[PDB]
Design a binder for this molecule. Sequence first.
Ligand SMILES: Nc1ncnc2c1ncn2[C@@H]1O[C@H](COP(=O)(O)OP(=O)(O)O)[C@@H](O)[C@H]1O
Ligand SMILES: Nc1ncnc2c1ncn2[C@@H]1O[C@H](COP(=O)(O)OP(=O)(O)O)[C@@H](O)[C@H]1O
Lengths: 481, 472, 520, 507
Amino acid sequence: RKVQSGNINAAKTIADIIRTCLGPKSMMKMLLDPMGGIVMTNDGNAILREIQVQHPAAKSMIEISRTQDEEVGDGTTSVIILAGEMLSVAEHFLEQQMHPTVVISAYRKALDDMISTLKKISIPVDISDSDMMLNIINSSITTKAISRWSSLACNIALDAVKMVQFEENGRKEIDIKKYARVEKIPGGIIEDSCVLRGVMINKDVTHPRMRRYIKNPRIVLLLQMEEEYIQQLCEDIIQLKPDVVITEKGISDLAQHYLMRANITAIRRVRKTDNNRIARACGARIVSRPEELREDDVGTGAGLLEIKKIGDEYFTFITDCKDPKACTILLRGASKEILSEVERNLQDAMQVCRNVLLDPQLVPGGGASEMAVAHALTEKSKAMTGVEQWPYRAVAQALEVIPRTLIQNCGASTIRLLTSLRAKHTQENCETWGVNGETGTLVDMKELGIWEPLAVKLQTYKTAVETAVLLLRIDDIVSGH
Amino acid sequence: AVYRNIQACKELAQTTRTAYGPNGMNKMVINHLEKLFVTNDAATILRELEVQHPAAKMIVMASHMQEQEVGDGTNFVLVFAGALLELAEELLRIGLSVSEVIEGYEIACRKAHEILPNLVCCSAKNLRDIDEVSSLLRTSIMSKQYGNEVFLAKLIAQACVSIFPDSGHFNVDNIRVCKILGSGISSSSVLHGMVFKKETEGDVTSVKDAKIAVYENLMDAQVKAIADTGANVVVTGGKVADMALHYANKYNIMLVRLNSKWDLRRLCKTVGATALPRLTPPVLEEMGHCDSVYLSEVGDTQVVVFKHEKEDGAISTIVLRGSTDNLMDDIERAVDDGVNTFKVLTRDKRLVPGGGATEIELAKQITSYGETCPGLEQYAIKKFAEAFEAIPRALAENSGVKANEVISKLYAVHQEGNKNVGLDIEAEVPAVKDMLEAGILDTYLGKYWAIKLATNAAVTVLRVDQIIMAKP
Amino acid sequence: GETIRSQNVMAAASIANIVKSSLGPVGLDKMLVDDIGDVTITNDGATILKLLEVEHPAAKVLCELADLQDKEVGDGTTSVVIIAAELLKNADELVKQKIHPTSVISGYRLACKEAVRYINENLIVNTDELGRDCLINAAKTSMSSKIIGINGDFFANMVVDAVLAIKYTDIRGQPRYPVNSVNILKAHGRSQMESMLISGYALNCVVGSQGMPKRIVNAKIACLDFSLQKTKMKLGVQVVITDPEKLDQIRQRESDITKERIQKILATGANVILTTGGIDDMCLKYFVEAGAMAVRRVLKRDLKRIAKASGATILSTLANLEGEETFEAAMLGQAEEVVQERICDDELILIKNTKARTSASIILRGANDFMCDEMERSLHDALCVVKRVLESKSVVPGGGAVEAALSIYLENYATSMGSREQLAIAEFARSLLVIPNTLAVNAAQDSTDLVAKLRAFHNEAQVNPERKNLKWIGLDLSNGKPRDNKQAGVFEPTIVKVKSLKFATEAAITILRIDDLIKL
Amino acid sequence: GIPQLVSNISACQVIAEAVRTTLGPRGMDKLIVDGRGKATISNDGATILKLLDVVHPAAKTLVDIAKSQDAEVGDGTTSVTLLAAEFLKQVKPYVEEGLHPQIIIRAFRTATQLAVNKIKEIAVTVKKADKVEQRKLLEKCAMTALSSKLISQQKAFFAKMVVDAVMMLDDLLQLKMIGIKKVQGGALEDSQLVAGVAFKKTFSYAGFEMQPKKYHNPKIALLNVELELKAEKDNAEIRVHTVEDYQAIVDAEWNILYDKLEKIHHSGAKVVSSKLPIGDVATQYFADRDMFCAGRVPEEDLKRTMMACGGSIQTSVNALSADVLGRCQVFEETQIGGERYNFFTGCPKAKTCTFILRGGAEQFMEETERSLHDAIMIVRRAIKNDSVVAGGGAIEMELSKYLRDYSRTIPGKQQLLIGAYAKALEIIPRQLCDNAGFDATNILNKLRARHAQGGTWYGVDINNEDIADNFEAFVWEPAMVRINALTAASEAACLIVSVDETIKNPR
Ligand SMILES: Nc1ncnc2c1ncn2[C@@H]1O[C@H](COP(=O)(O)OP(=O)(O)O)[C@@H](O)[C@H]1O
Ligand SMILES: Nc1ncnc2c1ncn2[C@@H]1O[C@H](COP(=O)(O)OP(=O)(O)O)[C@@H](O)[C@H]1O
């Protein structure tokens, strides 16, 4: 049992760090760097990322959180707290002399009940209404510098995921890494930012003889004996008379001598993902090599070709008036610090739209979703025949820590309000009577915008319980390779 | 200094958590007089175990109050109190105040006093039948002298039935204990009046004299002074001389030797004969009154019996036999535990099932009350119900069965409405059985005073938060 | 010396404690710390010892012990180490009792002989395929930990017929089963009970144009990997063309070659044409006229099973080093009916009555992919359980039934030999009780009770042979109670427990013969 | 809880280790020296624990059980000790494995009654089996105890003396009643048997040619008066200057001795015995009045005479009368080895006797002194209980197969506990293999397999290193005393496993 208890204190201490780093009143932390420096951040994602830990059970908590950051850019603070609080009940592991398998079956049984309980307090959303989506996304715009342009961030965040979603395939897959490439352009301000309705390539301009502005471009996707192939591979492209030569690999110096002779734009170092968006934008086709081109490899339907030097930096705009399962964001700012604020804050809002569009269902946040769940499992434990009911009730008492931290971070009497918070869920409906993060007192969530998506909490409790299962399944540490 | 007092009280629970129940363990007691003893009675452990921690002294003083108005439930004071403070840490570590817990238990203490009468399954018929006493007494003897509950349940039943017709006079002082070195329990029996082990030192087998005295030619006139005063029964404390032994036999004076001082003072308060220090002075005022003084031979051993033939008679003495003095002491406590069981039943008779039956049935109701009762005191009322569950856990651990399977099965039968269900007393069977059919019934009035004391002791401890020395 | 005996026993005994709690399918996981610092987590005993690095000589003897068990059986090696550990732990006390290892070694070798003979005297041959159930019960009990266990009888019956379809001996009365199991498919059938069993291979592709008939009764099936589209020489080397006029020649000439390929391919008469790289759009038009069933961009791994089904040869390329031929009467198989069924949102191509396939396909029709995914792993794992049993020519009831039965026989056999070897055979059989004594702890049950229940029923089997005695009583962990494997279906092969107790008794003798340690 | 029990497991094993090498007739000896420096060497297990005075609390538990086994039986208390310790040894790995201690008490209480049912069902009654007179059967069981000794050649002579000593006593038998004297000189076959009480009679003072050694019904006087002239008890010396006063002083010294001697004649004593010596001057007064005088009698021999003649031992001479003077039928003196021996045969209360050994060495009588105490008890317990079982650890091997085969059908936690109770009974024969120098490996491995082949009385042969049917060899032990020992050991172990925590008053 010494190894069973070692994973408790290994995770209980990690949860203690980010216990007060939750909510809009999240407390800051002081991390002493080895060079005497101090970082005064408050995000639990970056705090534990730099802190080196000695126990292996605590190192798994970091690998689990990073995978959560890719799915949803928030809520990861509670992922470790619930997994740390679930394992903090040592009365049922060692003092009661129960097996770990006894408790794993109890948590897995409680997992299926928590999932159904969160869907009972769900609510549909009308994504067609941009005003109803503004109340949802504002949960991340508050307490930020982007609050001055909240309406602009709403238009940039909500409409961008609509371009990535392809609802004809049935699954309605949304991928931010491939179809939502966010790029920056110097010059301008946050107000000057807009969403490009097409593809933008970050290729700088090397030669002066290139088509600067064309309203109907044409895109083509792909000493003696040395210049033999170079002149021929370049002469097969001008048969279609293009305006921008988009190559996958790098172009040689002599092959560019014919690209500048033609006074056409020369683009290179383009991914395979990037060319498919172009082929779907202007209807072109990706050919293996330049020598086997056909008539279909043209840019009919393209918006315009512009490689203008905007903000002392060239940018190839090949946008169009279509949404070819892709999008491109144009972030404008006077400085890099301001650009770094809008670039990262929109990624927190852009991922919230991903959860709503895949499943338009919300949940009452601010401690309301936990009490709605913990109240359902407590009454169910009195009628659950089996020894698993005891650890089944510990989950009802352990999930109360999420609202406990929000009231404790505010400084109000957490013991007085949390006990009365149970009565609101006991008598009245569980979909209301939440907790105000800023004020600290109780308030209903229908009147406030603390509503979180459904996919954020589903991955939370699935990964919070799965983390405790993986840690309680351990009983010995093996050293060797 | 609250966490240190709670942890100090848990140290005392483990010294009596395992000695509780029929499958309970014994404890290797070593007397202060350099003597070895082995027993499982919790009252005897604390008498020798000097509890020096002041935090736990309140629990011991609560057990002293368990002597008045009741003679059972001492382990309830030690186990139920330890479980309340043990779970009290779970509330304080959350952030709850110590004062809200004090007022929370006083609410649950009253709530349990209202739920306990609803669980009274049966009551004593008070028919003064031997089968009535022995059938109901099967619960109190076990866990004190286990395995020999058959003979003991019928012996004491004969002593109590003799006193119930004398209504308003039944007490533990009427049923005294007299043990003799012998074979075992098979030769033990019950007799009326006062019975001692030392046989008649003199030659008199029977004498109907009234006056009893308690304490070469000269000594022959002094023994005659006992006869001149009208007394033919002389009781010497220490050894008796060889010349004084024969002088009592000449005038047919019954000589009796009582070495133990408890035997001497017992006569002072029954017949009235007080012990005089001088060498047999002629003092008639300090002599006693007895109807008949005769010698009886019961169990192949002569014994002096003071039968009050003329009076109604209310003095009972159980004649015990046993080859071991250490083992007969364990029977001495079970006899006093059974006599005090029915001493409470002289009042209004109410009987509840034992074996953790009421402790889950009482917790199942208070827990449902705590869920529907809002306020800042519900956290304390909930743990007051979960604190009752530790008493089943005490019996499950001593029975060698996993306590987790016990609480689940006790909750499942009561969930379906099957009341009167307790723990199955068997190591190979983690199931349960009906306590009503088995004959396991505790005392209602004992639990009313036991839950009252264990809550007041736990509140008395939680009210204290720091210990500071002083000097007058 | 004796101090070296005690230190070598604890070394091998502690190796078993690493894989002790991880015994059985409910085994606990453990962290594997490598030299770098990574943490690999698993409960498989075989994978633990392959990465376990413990610097001690007595422990490396257990590594070679596992190598032969991996090549001989390939499973259950975790139990080989725990039995051997108990023999050394028990033999250590005998050395303290003034007993020589030779008397202990001589007793253990005889005890292994009677163990193999007693098992052979209580075997059950490979039977109960049709007409008797340990078949439905064999698969229904294994799939209880998944969501598929709602209706176990409906899903367990499809596993019975799947094993019989993959049954072909081919060697002197071999009967075994192949590695390629029944390819399990899935679709949205609006409910889990719509799972349809197909007694034939199913290709998850579509023909494209609807004008082609979906009823081909021709037995000739054309199987090709060569794409009939524009054939490129190599994706790394492109044919150099110094004239745009010459580009149109090779462009139009390539379409002219397909006009000759489309006739030579259909000259075989095969209406079922399957291409891996794809079929040209102009070439699909000729199949609508002739009425051939063509499918483009078929998975090569799926085509490998179709070629194995109808017996076709996988034609890599039409160019046979001098020209371009279609390999007539080589890539053609023989089948009876290929009808493209209309399944929910997927027109699956069903194949029936080929030359020789010995396979099937399961359409796990459900409501969503969350259930069909969990249902696919249950049946794929349940197939291996019945496949492992009905291949081994003779099997034995496992799950604590073999080790508990030997606890009484070999203990009674020890009371017949004597000759300074009774304590060795007495403790050799007592050591085998650790297998159920260990599985009881992993099953969250009382370890002392369940082992006594098995020996309580296994002893009555030898007192009298009457039918009242409970015989062949295994131990099920899903319920924590003994059960009859004859009714439950918890069977194991014969050679496993034979070779398991064989090397476990031999490896313990090898370490028992080590009395001193010489180093350099 | 758990660790306090393990401390008691090992605290009791050291007590078993103190008497582990004493099991059997051929056991090892120890040397326990007291505070005075006195040497005490004995192989008896009960005597070892009486002088050790172990102050450990858990150790005194088995001491109280052994004393009860000695008070009732007087032999076999070691077997209660080693068995009580082995029940704690085999359950030692099971205690630390998480099993409750109270569950073990149910197992020993279950296996103990299972043994009594098997012992009473297997024991064989032997009263007049095989049509043999009981004198021969009591001689057959007795001679086997004397074999393989220094008196193996003339064991038939000594075997007949024991059957005569028991039959001369009444139905009530007692081992202490039959006294054994040791006299150096002569051969082995010259050992005599006296039915009455006798003493060495070291009286070598005057009184020759008189004091007849024959009497019809003599009155045996038991005094403690030193009748010497210059005695430390009687004397007279008055230091004065007058000369005529000295004649009265020397006359007063003779009157103190003589006036006390007249009380011996007036009381009616015919055979006057006294512990303190009697001088040659007092023996003549007994010789003149035709009186028998023989002093220098030990105090122990007179206690056997007080139980034989039926009188009482008086210190003073004035209290000598007919109340304390015993009687007998045949009082005669012998010449065993030339030394004088007076003895009273045919007394009314002749419950005791005397047995004088002979031999040319002091140590040959020591080994004979030990063997006779073992042969008497066999005759004492053979007539007491005709239902007996095979000796030499044979009964312990029967229960090992029955309780084990019974444990194989008892599911639950009682299996390995009652099963371990079987292996715990193997300590008795294993010690007889080691305490006799034999190889316990070959014997127990060959002995346990004999029972499955059909053996029911085979046991450890203490003489030869082989197995033998101890029942056919007339090596028997009582069936009930074996039950009283197993019930005593089970009660001894159950008291230890019932303890889980030690409580001590701080003093
Ligand atoms: N305005 C608010 N009022 C009350 N609670 C809030 C508010 N905003 C956030 N919270 C709570 O803070 C928790 C953490 O939110 P967030 O910071 O988005 O995730 P993380 O802390 O993991 O970065 C949520 O569970 C939510 O219930
Ligand atoms: N046969 C039994 N079955 C279950 N519980 C018992 C039994 N006998 C006694 N107990 C319990 O053990 C605790 C102590 O019992 P008892 O010895 O009668 O009182 P005390 O220990 O105060 O003298 C009581 O609460 C009682 O319920």
